[PDB]
Amino acid sequence: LRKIKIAAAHSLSLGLLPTIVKQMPTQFTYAVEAIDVDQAVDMLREGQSDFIFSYHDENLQPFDNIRLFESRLFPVCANNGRGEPRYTLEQPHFPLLNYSQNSYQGRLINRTLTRHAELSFSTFFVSSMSELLKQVAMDGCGIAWLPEYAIRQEITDGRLIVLDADELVIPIQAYAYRMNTRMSQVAETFWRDLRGLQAAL
Amino acid sequence: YTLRKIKIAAAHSLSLGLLPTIVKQMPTQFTYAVEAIDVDQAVDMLREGQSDFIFSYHDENLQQAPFDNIRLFESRLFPVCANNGPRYTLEQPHFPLLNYSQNSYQGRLINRTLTRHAELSFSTFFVSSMSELLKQVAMDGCGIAWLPEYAIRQEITDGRLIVLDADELVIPIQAYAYRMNTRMSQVAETFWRDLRGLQA
């Protein structure tokens, strides 16, 4: 009861909901779905989800928005243990850990890798779950573009090394999308309290 | 550009707790394509050639022709919650329940366990099929969640998550890798044979 159905993109539900539900002023019920970027417009218009936590989709930007945070995508990889990166960008056919071809982050990385034809890589692991790519990268199996907030503590400890920070960086902005049409009594209550909570992410 | 691709439709909990160990140990002769898919959705994709293997739990009909099975390991799902410096008790009026949806093996199994035990009054508070999300919400003191011990082993030994039962409410689980017993690509037959060796 008093359910709030949220469908988030394949890699930003973790960085948001734990902090949201803990700091939420009043108590709701939550149902969370990991959807692709393509299924964002349709699920809102049909009412499949009351709110969609997605990136900067300018199609949704008859909708209302609220920017949750701002981050970047840094190419990272685990170290040898010597303090040197296990792989390197200038290495012939380095193992690449990428997102799916239909994900929002996957299209950004493949866009940058097309522009920078200097990088010679080999696809090794592809999945739209950023948590899976993060733990696969820590094993030292390849290079991955990971969000800064998702590896902030791992970057501090040299268990993941930043390989580039000038041109291979992809800025990302996460939003919470709502239809401008007024919703239930509980959805407006949740949307208001989240707006009163954006000073915590 | 994918003759070394292996399509893996795994359970959300198993894909994030077991697959990184598999990928690290395997020889890098492969290219992995993994997606978190419900087991009742992954079986349909397995027959029509949309996936090569699926990683899920004990299925009665998936362990027989025209399928082949590999018993990956064995584990259990413990009732768990955050610490008080336990915030919640299983013997408590309407405790908030963090649980998977019915579109996931673990969701039905937890709900069917609570079916027999009417002594526990709970309140469905947060439902999602992403295990890592269930875990973080549990560690922030939001409710009780039945999480697998392979995913919360070290936070149990650190106190951030306290086991709430070690008797009736601990449900056993066994990880499994399934596939059609028919021929696939050479890159997938090698991975399957290495999986029998990897289990040990």
Side-chain angles (χ1 to χ4, degrees):
Chain A
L1 91 161
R2 302 320 77 232
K3 237 176 58 164
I4 281 300
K5 342 204 203 83
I6 328 185
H10 266 85
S11 147
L12 90 176
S13 78
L14 197 275
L16 277 35
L17 309 156
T19 69
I20 292 174
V21 302
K22 170 59 183 134
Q23 283 256 295
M24 257 297 120
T26 167
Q27 269 35 254
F28 311 92
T29 302
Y30 298 82
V32 188
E33 282 183 341
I35 58 134
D36 266 317
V37 57
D38 309 79
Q39 330 168 243
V41 156
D42 316 343
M43 289 181 67
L44 267 184
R45 293 209 196 247
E46 184 154 48
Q48 325 182 38
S49 274
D50 309 331
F51 310 96
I52 297 263
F53 290 4
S54 178
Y55 300 98
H56 183 91
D57 296 358
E58 197 147 310
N59 50 17
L60 300 154
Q61 174 89 15
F63 309 95
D64 194 12
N65 67 81
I66 185 191
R67 172 183 289 173
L68 303 180
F69 67 92
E70 224 151 28
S71 181
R72 305 196 257 187
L73 294 173
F74 294 92
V76 287
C77 86
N79 52 329
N80 283 94
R82 175 67 217 101
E84 44 171 286
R86 165 119 181 250
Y87 300 107
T88 172
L89 306 158
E90 319 73 8
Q91 168 180 339
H93 322 116
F94 58 84
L96 175 60
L97 325 170
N98 198 6
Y99 300 87
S100 55
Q101 306 261 256
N102 51 77
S103 63
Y104 183 84
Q105 289 158 318
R107 301 164 186 163
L108 290 168
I109 305 165
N110 297 328
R111 154 192 314 188
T112 304
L113 291 164
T114 305
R115 153 174 30 193
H116 293 74
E118 46 260 51
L119 309 175
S120 163
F121 57 86
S122 90
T123 314
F124 177 80
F125 197 103
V126 47
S127 173
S128 38
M129 298 174 281
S130 188
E131 192 70 18
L132 183 49
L133 301 182
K134 191 238 209 176
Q135 310 215 61
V136 166
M138 291 145 116
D139 300 335
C141 298
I143 300 174
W145 263 257
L146 291 175
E148 174 267 325
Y149 73 93
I151 56 179
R152 205 176 75 91
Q153 263 33 79
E154 288 77 13
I155 288 305
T156 325
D157 284 7
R159 284 162 65 234
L160 292 164
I161 272 72
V162 184
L163 299 168
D164 178 292
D166 68 306
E167 298 183 285
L168 306 191
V169 286
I170 299 139
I172 54 179
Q173 309 89 41
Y175 290 73
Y177 290 105
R178 167 184 108 88
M179 297 216 62
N180 244 319
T181 88
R182 200 206 254 188
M183 311 167 149
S184 90
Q185 308 233 354
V186 200
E188 297 292 333
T189 315
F190 168 85
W191 180 259
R192 204 177 300 102
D193 283 329
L194 172 82
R195 206 167 52 209
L197 202 33
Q198 55 188 331
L201 311 95
Chain B
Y1 296 84
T2 77
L3 179 67
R4 336 290 156 181
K5 225 192 212 212
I6 290 96
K7 283 308 297 157
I8 313 270
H12 204 302
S13 189
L14 262 178
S15 64
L16 266 49
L18 166 75
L19 260 73
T21 300
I22 297 186
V23 164
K24 157 95 186 55
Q25 271 179 319
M26 289 286 185
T28 167
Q29 309 165 258
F30 314 110
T31 287
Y32 301 85
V34 185
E35 56 263 85
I37 296 298
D38 324 286
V39 59
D40 292 351
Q41 179 192 137
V43 173
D44 283 56
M45 306 173 58
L46 193 66
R47 281 218 214 68
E48 61 202 17
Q50 299 305 318
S51 279
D52 300 325
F53 314 91
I54 67 136
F55 282 64
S56 182
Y57 311 98
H58 178 98
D59 214 68
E60 170 247 355
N61 272 324
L62 286 184
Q63 297 170 28
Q64 200 225 22
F67 295 92
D68 195 355
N69 62 78
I70 284 181
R71 192 184 60 94
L72 285 160
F73 59 84
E74 73 303 347
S75 186
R76 36 222 172 107
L77 296 129
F78 280 95
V80 79
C81 68
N83 85 308
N84 259 2
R87 160 145 173 179
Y88 292 110
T89 305
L90 293 168
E91 278 226 61
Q92 161 166 339
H94 55 67
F95 62 86
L97 170 80
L98 326 162
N99 186 7
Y100 316 82
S101 63
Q102 298 81 356
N103 289 0
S104 67
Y105 186 113
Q106 294 163 112
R108 278 99 60 168
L109 175 53
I110 293 159
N111 272 28
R112 197 167 70 260
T113 287
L114 311 188
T115 280
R116 315 178 233 270
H117 303 256
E119 53 258 31
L120 294 96
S121 89
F122 61 95
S123 291
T124 296
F125 161 72
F126 184 100
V127 157
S128 178
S129 283
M130 328 189 220
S131 61
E132 253 287 293
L133 182 61
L134 271 200
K135 208 190 126 185
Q136 258 296 331
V137 176
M139 301 200 296
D140 300 331
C142 292
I144 297 157
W146 267 262
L147 298 178
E149 87 160 320
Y150 60 77
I152 63 170
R153 188 53 235 175
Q154 67 206 329
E155 299 94 8
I156 280 176
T157 69
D158 293 346
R160 324 217 278 130
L161 294 158
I162 305 134
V163 166
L164 291 184
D165 180 275
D167 190 28
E168 223 147 45
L169 320 181
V170 186
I171 311 115
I173 40 163
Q174 312 84 23
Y176 274 94
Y178 297 107
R179 64 161 272 194
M180 316 295 302
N181 56 7
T182 52
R183 198 67 186 189
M184 296 165 313
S185 54
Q186 188 56 52
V187 82
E189 303 292 334
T190 294
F191 175 83
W192 185 249
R193 292 201 288 175
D194 291 352
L195 208 53
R196 329 208 83 264
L198 171 140
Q199 190 287 146

